[PDB]
Structures are given as C-alpha cells and as structure tokens.
Amino acid sequence: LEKLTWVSEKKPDWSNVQKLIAACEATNQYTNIGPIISQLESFIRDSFLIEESKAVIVTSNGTSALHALVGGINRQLGRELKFVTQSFTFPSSNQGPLKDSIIVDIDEDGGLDLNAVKNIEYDGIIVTNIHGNVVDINKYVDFCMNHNKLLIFDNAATGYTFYLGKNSCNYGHASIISFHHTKPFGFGEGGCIIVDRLYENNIRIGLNFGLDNSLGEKSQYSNQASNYRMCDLNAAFILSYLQNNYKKIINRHSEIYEIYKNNLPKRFKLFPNHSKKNPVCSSICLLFDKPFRLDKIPFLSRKYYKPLDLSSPVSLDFYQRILCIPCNIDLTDRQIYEIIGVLNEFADKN
Amino acid sequence: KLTWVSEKKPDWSNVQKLIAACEATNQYTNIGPIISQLESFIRDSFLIEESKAVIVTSNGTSALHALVGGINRQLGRELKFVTQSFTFPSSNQGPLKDSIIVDIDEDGGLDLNAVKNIEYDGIIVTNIHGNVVDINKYVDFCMNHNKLLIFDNAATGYTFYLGKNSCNYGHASIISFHHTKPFGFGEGGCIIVDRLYENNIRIGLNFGLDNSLGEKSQYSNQASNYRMCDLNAAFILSYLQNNYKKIINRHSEIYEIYKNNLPKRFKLFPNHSKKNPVCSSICLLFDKPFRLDKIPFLSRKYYKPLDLSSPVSLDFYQRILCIPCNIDLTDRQIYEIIGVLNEFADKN
Ligand SMILES: Cc1cn([C@H]2C[C@H](O)[C@@H](COP(=O)(O)OP(=O)(O)O)O2)c(=O)[nH]c1=O
Ligand SMILES: Cc1cn([C@H]2C[C@H](O)[C@@H](COP(=O)(O)OP(=O)(O)O)O2)c(=O)[nH]c1=O
Ligand SMILES: Cc1ncc(COP(=O)(O)O)c(CN)c1O
Ligand SMILES: Cc1ncc(COP(=O)(O)O)c(CN)c1O
Ligand SMILES: [Cl-]
Question: Where are the transmembrane segments (chain B)?
Fold first, then answer.
C-alpha cells in the first residue's frame, strides 16, 4: 500500500502525438480551432456515446467548460443567469460567471436538495454527479421541466456512468467533463461541454470572446465570453491518451467498483449511486457510519468535497463521513483486498 | 502568399527532453517541473526586474483575469477598473466584465481626462502591437491619485521605456503567448506583477486553494482555473529558446524599413519608446478613414473599439492598417507592401 498513487502513471505515446500534431505543423494552426479539435470532439462523441441532439465542445479545462457553458447561454438569452449549485462540490460552480451563484445543501442521495430552492429566485440549477456516481437524474429533469429551469450536470469526474440506458452526460440541458490529469480520462488540462444543439453556436463563439468568424469584420465581442477554447496541442495529448487507454480504464474501473461492492468493509457504505451498471469512478467513495479524521487511515486517501458553504449540514456530514480511495488502472486486486482489510481493522477500533 | 505569423514547428527532441521531467513524476499540471523553467526563462530573456513576479497562465486573457482576481482576493472587494475602448475584449470580460470603457487620446492610450469624475480603483492601459504609450504619465497619475495601474502588454513583450522592458512599469503587466503573437506557441500567458500580490495571484490560478493550509485551504469566488499546463510551458519554452533573439532583432529590422520608407500619407502608430519596438504587426495610420477591402494583401484592423462611441478609438480603427510582421517576411515582400500602399495612397 506504500505504492498507492491517486492517478495511474501517464506518459505520451510520442509517435502517436507527433502523428496528430503533424496536421498542426502542416497548416501552422495550433489553436483557434485547428485540425485536432474535431478529432477529439468526434472521439468523445463516438467513444462516450453522446447523443446526436448534443454538441461536444472541448475547452481549456473542466472549469472553463462550465464557465463557457454558462457564458454562452447568458449571451444567447441576453441576461446573466442566476444558478443554484450544491454545497458538496468543487469551487468551479461558484466562480467566473457563477461567482454569485446561490449555494444550497445536498440531500442524502448526493445531489442538490430541491426542497432548498422552494422560495428562491433562480434561472437554473447545477447538480454534481460525485466522482463517477450519479444522482437520481430523472427527479432533476422532471423538476426543471415542471418549473421551466435550466439543468446542468457537473460531470467533471463522471465521463462514462450510464443512467437508464445512456451516458449520464446526455441528461439535462448540458453537462461538463474534465480531462485534468487527476481524472481517469485526463491528460494535463482539458474540458468538454455536452450541450443541447440550440446553444451550440453561441457557446462555440463564446470560447473566442463572443467573436463570430461568420460575421467577418462585423463580429462583436460579448462581455459574457472569454478565451475558453482548447489548444490543439492539449487536444492531441488527450486524444492519444484516450486512443491508447480509454477501454482499459472503463473496464478496470468497473472491475475495481465490483470488488468493493461485493466485499464492503464493516460500517462503510458505497456513496449513493443510481446507475444499474457499475459507475466509472475517479476514486472509490465510501461513507463510514460516523464522522472520522483522515489521519486514522494509514494509506493514501482523501476527503472530497470540502463544502463550499459550511452552513450546509448534509454536505458537511458527507465530508466528515467520506473516504475517497485511489481508483486507477495501476491498482492491483491484492492492494484492494489489503485496503478492505485495513478498513475492517479501522471499523473494529472506531 | 503573406502569413500573419511565422511557421512554427516543435523542436521535438527538446520538447521531449523538457517533458521527460513530467514523465518521471507524473506531474503535468498543478505547477509541474516546467513552470519554473519557463518563468525563469522569461525573467532572464525579457529582463524582468527582481521586484516583479513572473507568473505563467493558460492564455493572455487568463493572465489579465488572474491578475485582477488575485488582487480582488487580497484587497477583499471586486475592484472597478477603467479600460480604453481601443483594446481587445479581454479587459471587459471575466472579473472585468463590468469595467468602465473610456476613449484613448491621440498617443494611443487611455485618456486620463475621461476619468476625472468617475469612481474607480484602477486603470488598464494597452500598449498597442508592441508600441508603448508615455508610460510615466500613467505611472505619475496613478501614484498621485492612489490608483492601481495595469499595462495590457499582450502584444508588447519586448518594447523598452527609459532603459527597461515596458512590462516592468505599473503594478503589473500581462503578455500573451498566443500562436498569433511573435513570442507565442499555441496558447499561453504571463503576469509580471509587484511581489506584494504574487502569492495571492499564484493561489488564485488554483481556485484560491492555498496548498500551504492543507485541509484548511479555502477557495475564493474571485479565482478560477487559470494555471498554465506544463505541456504548453514546454512548447512555449522550446520555441523561445530556439527563436526569441532572432524575433527581437528581425522585428526591429522590419520596423526600420517602414520607418525609413513610410508610404505616402501613412504615419507610424504612436510609440513613446526611443528604441524600435518589437511589433506583433506593423501598425500604420492613414490620413483618412478607409476600408480594409481596398488593401490587396493580408492585413487587419485591430482593435475594433469595445465602445464604438469613443471617437478617437473609432478614428484610429478607421485609419489603421495592421501589416504582417514575422521572421518569415523578406525585405523584398516589405518593399512590395510599401509599393502597394503608395499606389493605394495615390488612388484614395
Ligand atoms: C490561431 C492561429 C492563427 N494563425 C493566423 C490566421 C490569421 O491569418 C491570423 C490571425 O488569426 P485569428 O484567428 O484571426 O486571430 P484573431 O481572431 O485574434 O484576430 O493568424 C495561424 O497562422 N496559426 C494559428 O494557430
Ligand atoms: C496535477 C497532478 C496531480 N497528481 C496527483 C498528486 C495528488 O496525489 C493527486 C491530486 O492532485 P491535487 O493537486 O491535490 O489536485 P486536487 O486539488 O484536485 O485534489 O494527483 C498527479 O499525479 N499528476 C498531476 O499532473
Ligand atoms: C466537481 C468538479 N467540477 C469541476 C471541476 C473543475 O475541473 P478542472 O480541474 O478541469 O478545471 C472539478 C475538478 N476538481 C470537479 O471535481
Ligand atoms: C491587447 C490584448 N489583450 C489581451 C489579449 C488576449 O490574449 P490571449 O489571446 O492570449 O487570451 C489579446 C489577444 N489578441 C490582446 O491583443
Ligand atoms: Cl525610451
């Protein structure tokens, strides 16, 4: 267990990366949507099973995926949209165009508490599918349909979990994924928006300051936009990593979830998850039955997410009870069983 | 035939040797082993002063936004900046989405007359395409009125003012390493900033999360993901190692030809430097408004005013011609351009 790493060891396939970036070299186009962007967006669409009704839009990072998604929709609708995010999530959904988002608690199933938005003025909600686990997506889709609200899934850590027969990224108006090095599908930095086609053109123009190349000299910036595009260099490293490893990651991460599911240590439960098939997790998240401190676990382990608003009791209860265990393609079954042994010993003494 | 930028190709051997450091530790972002190498290269090669931090970011826009976000976090409020209309949209986006837009004066920078009766914390002055404003008039004004001063040097990485890189003036400046810039490769940015703000700006590239506080780290709503990936750092560092000297020298030599052979009724963009600027494009001003589609070679007008009601900014936009300036251009091509522009002056 001294050998545990958070992330599998990742190295460029240099001959493959050079083959991809040769198309940049040929045209001197390495950004502003060069020849690699379409290849990675196509690879994501076909490999992650994104539906035809959705755009696949790569961005510089998972954060810029969320911010470009919101910026683009704000520009299309002509106002700064007010979003609610859950406290039990990463800071990205209270930053950029979401810097004044309303923060509310989660319910005990891991997602934003729809009861907390009863008396609030807002335009949409952002629901986080934690570390590859999914919430009961239909209850958010129905709520947002009934109340004419936009629905975004923060799928930063959740690229290939299936809910009722399709990739969870295909639900709500939009979802985002992260290709940050720390993520299963990540290499360096990167993000992706999966979004209803109605907003696709404004979101793409929104990566380029709001400047529509189709208008030529008549293009006009939007104060809702920024520089949010993915560089073709980064697209090549991410595409090469996925071409060489995507299949092994989806299979092994499912195999790793399978061992914990069938061999749960005493007084630990799996994090709430609504997928029939095993999720593809960024870490294996267990909930101990009472608060505990990370320093009592003698192997590499973390707590996510530190609540954005400390006045959210369910979020804090989860933070206090969660254990996030490394989940990557370098982990051995021997290590998984030894981890389950250590948590059984921890359970005995606490 | 003309191109906006020079053909740029990775030195694969050198890029691989740099990224070998990432491969040995599996660290390719969150400040891997290349970031300090690029920031040191910039410090030494661009002649940044010891009183300044060099902070690499994902792009020139994120350099500006991370600079503002970091200072907002340190001062505990959302700072109100004024920017000039004759600039790129970055200074009216992100934390600057509600910046105040005023006109330029005829020397190419923010008109200090326009801010007399306005409430604001700071100004952003754009040094256009490698040309510099009268930097000390801004430095003195901001000292007298206790205002923050930022130079948008996105296109102005190596223009000197009173003996030192123009990036060393104001509280801070930013540079772009966008592929379209002389020093660029792919995407990238850099903040040059007073050390007082260095720590909060570096933490603000990481959502405001200070890895020094361990589990006590607390995010800022003024921050984001603004860091430069080590992969990009390697491609930018390799390109600068192999080319920065050739670029500075050839861009100066290109400017020399235009300065000494100005086409009729064209003037050099206002430049307060006593040395030739290192330009992202050669910016000429015609004596009257004209349409780009009358120029029969690759050319642009930067910048379309952010506020089209700023009359000097709109006049500059209507009269400007931005001509390619890169190390692939031959002297023969430059004299051909000046020939076509003499013909344009005759016909217009
Ligand atoms: C982004 C990029 C642009 N260019 C060229 C294309 C154009 O002639 C010129 C300007 O590109 P452009 O995309 O117009 O930049 P902007 O919209 O900010 O003006 O640079 C390249 O050669 N390579 C690249 O990677
Ligand atoms: C950024 C990065 C992190 N890591 C490892 C270091 C840590 O053990 C783990 C998490 O990184 P960390 O920097 O803590 O990210 P976060 O703030 O999202 O938790 O990933 C890599 O192995 N490679 C990388 O390029
Ligand atoms: C839930 C969530 N949302 C957004 C992000 C931001 O992704 P990136 O790090 O690629 O900006 C993260 C990554 N920490 C995340 O975990
Ligand atoms: C003056 C100015 N400011 C900021 C930027 C933004 O830099 P980047 O394209 O690297 O985001 C640019 C790029 N055109 C610029 O010209
Ligand atoms: Cl000078």
Answer: none
